[PDB]
Structure formats: C-alpha cells, structure tokens
C-alpha cells in the first residue's frame, strides 16, 4: 500500500511555471509506473503525463507536450511535473497515481490507475 501525496500547486499568472511533486511513501517508486491526471471543474480526470517503473518510457498528452515535462528523483521517492507556459485552461486539480497493472507501461485511461493522492490545486489567472 503505496501512498501518494501531491504538492507544489498554487495560484500563478498565465505564462508562469510550476513544479508539482508526487511523493510516495510505504513503497519504492521504482516499482511503479506513475502518471499525472488533471480534473478541471465539471470534467473528468484527464491524462497529462506518465513515466514508467524504469523511468525510460515517458509520455505526454498533446495539449501539454512541449510545455510540461515529467521526471523521477529516486533519492526522494518523488516524481516531478515541470509545468511551463501555463495557461488559464491548465487550471485544475492535479492528481498523481500508479499503474495498477504491470501489464501496461503506458496507459491513458484512468481506470488503469490507482492509489490516487488527494491532489493539488493549480489556478492560472489571466
């Protein structure tokens, strides 16, 4: 029973950057594929980015590709989501989660994930 906590959110201006953290406890991060999803008001949890057990596979949603980047820090048991050139339409609650099956390395479907954190708020004002 891995436990995830998101942090690093907050209120920012359009064009600014943020770095979100997904910090694991109870289990090593090296054993899991880790993804970020985001849920804007009234919408579903939308896929943002993923990084494998291995850290060698990384992937991104089209809407954030080129702006966001995902990384792992094994020493802190933490996955980072560097978010640059933020826009109002990036305003959401950002969650992290683990792939609940080792049969996929990438998945974009939220049902394929588990152990969701409480999430962190990202607000991007104009």
Domain residue ranges of the chain, discontinuous segments joined by + = 1-126
- Determine the 3-state secondary structure of 85 from DSSP: coil
Q: For domain 1-126, give the CATH number.
A: 2.60.40.10
Alpha-carbon distance 64 to 112, whole Å?
Answer: 21
CA angle 101–93–100, rounded 5-degree value: 5
β 113-114/34-39 pair status: unpaired
User: Is there a contact between 68 and 86 (Cβ–Cβ < 8 Å)?
Assistant: no
Alpha-carbon distance 37 to 100, whole Å?
Answer: 15
Resolution in units of Å: 2.7
CA angle 90–115–96, rounded 5-degree value: 20
**Both structure tokens of 81:** 């989501």
β 58-60/3-7 pair status: unpaired
């Amino acid at each position: 029973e891995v436990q995830l906590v998101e942090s690093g959110g907050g209120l920012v201006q359009a064009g600014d950057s943020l770095r979100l953290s997904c910090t694991a406890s109870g289990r090593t991060l090296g054993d899991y594929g880790v993804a970020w999803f985001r849920q804007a008001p009234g919408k579903e949890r939308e896929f943002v980015s993923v990084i494998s057990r291995s850290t060698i596979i990384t992937d991104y949603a089209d809407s954030v590709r080129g702006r966001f980047s995902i990384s792992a820090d094994s020493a802190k048991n933490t996955v980072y989501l560097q978010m640059n050139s933020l826009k109002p339409e990036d305003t959401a609650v950002y969650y992290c989660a683990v792939i609940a099956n080792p049969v996929y390395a990438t998945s974009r479907n939220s049902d394929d994930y588990g152990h969701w954190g409480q999430g962190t708020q990202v607000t991007v004002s104009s």
